[PDB]
Design an enzyme around this catalytic site. Sequence first.
Site, PDB file in Angstrom:
ATOM      1  N   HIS A 168       0.723  -1.274   0.000  1.00  0.00           N
ATOM      2  CA  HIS A 168       0.000   0.000   0.000  1.00  0.00           C
ATOM      3  C   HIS A 168       0.758   1.335   0.000  1.00  0.00           C
ATOM      4  CE1 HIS A 168      -3.544   2.545   1.464  1.00  0.00           C
ATOM      5  NE2 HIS A 168      -3.997   1.938   0.380  1.00  0.00           N
ATOM      6  N   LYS A 197       2.811   4.669  -0.963  1.00  0.00           N
ATOM      7  CA  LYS A 197       2.823   5.604  -2.091  1.00  0.00           C
ATOM      8  C   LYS A 197       4.000   6.490  -1.680  1.00  0.00           C
ATOM      9  CE  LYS A 197      -1.765   5.139  -0.588  1.00  0.00           C
ATOM     10  NZ  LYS A 197      -2.078   3.870  -1.301  1.00  0.00           N
ATOM     11  N   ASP A 199      17.194  11.079  -4.293  1.00  0.00           N
ATOM     12  CA  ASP A 199      18.583  11.374  -3.989  1.00  0.00           C
ATOM     13  C   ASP A 199      19.039  10.964  -2.582  1.00  0.00           C
ATOM     14  OD1 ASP A 199      18.730  12.326  -6.554  1.00  0.00           O
ATOM     15  OD2 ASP A 199      18.606  14.443  -6.035  1.00  0.00           O
TER      16      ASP A 199
END
Lengths: 152, 152
Positions: free
Chosen positions: A93, A95, A100
């Site tokens: 789930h 996101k 960098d």
Amino acid sequence: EPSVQVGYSPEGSARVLVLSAIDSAKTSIRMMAYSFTAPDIMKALVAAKKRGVDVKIVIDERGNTGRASIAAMNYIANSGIPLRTDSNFPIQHDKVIIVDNVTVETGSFNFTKAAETKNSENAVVIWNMPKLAESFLEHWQDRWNQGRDYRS
Amino acid sequence: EPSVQVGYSPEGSARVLVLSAIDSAKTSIRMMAYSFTAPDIMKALVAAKKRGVDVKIVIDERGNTGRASIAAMNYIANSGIPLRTDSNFPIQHDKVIIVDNVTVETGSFNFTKAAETKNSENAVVIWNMPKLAESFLEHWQDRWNQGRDYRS
């Protein structure tokens, strides 16, 4: 040095902020996604690769079998961006976009059209916090390591 | 003063961190949720109210008609905690907890059992960043203002 930015949907600021994080990458991008379909996000990721950025992505497997999901996955693999599907969790789930090795984008925002233009969402970008990012990296690495390559 | 903590699921650290944020509230809690069902989260919110904390919650309407959702909503309203359902968005997808007007918890973590114990998730708590929290508050306020009271 550390700072935080936020954007919301359907206002439009979340989408732009997420694009800003990807557009800012000079060396690396380690992404985790559930629904992976937004054309704008894909175009930005491949533009990063073209810039020379080391981009690697692990996405949820079961939730990415729809037509739009396949189009994005194909588009991404065709660009030489290492991509994997992960089914070891009922739902991967997260996101998340780690940029960098020191910046982390996260929130409710899924990388989809509905997330950008219809739902109420929030996306935050936590800039220049190396310790936070390396921790997130371990989270990304663990999920990537048990994923299945999706190539072209 | 500002700092950031992260926790993950199914590891267990995300759940504990989210509980830590609620348990830390001395004056206020402004929460936004999609699926609203975790008993542990509800118990913690009502313990906050009992402590005197000003707790207000706005949750997604369509995604909260299941039995567990109703049990939590009833449990919460019975405690005198102002609660509203919001259907003005295909999905009020935010999973956010704003504490004491200066702290913000956010991430992929839904306030559910699956989010705590089965899915891969991340939850972050951004402490002592007043500007970030007041911005999130405007986001919370806008969604609350178009919600429907759920009382007991």
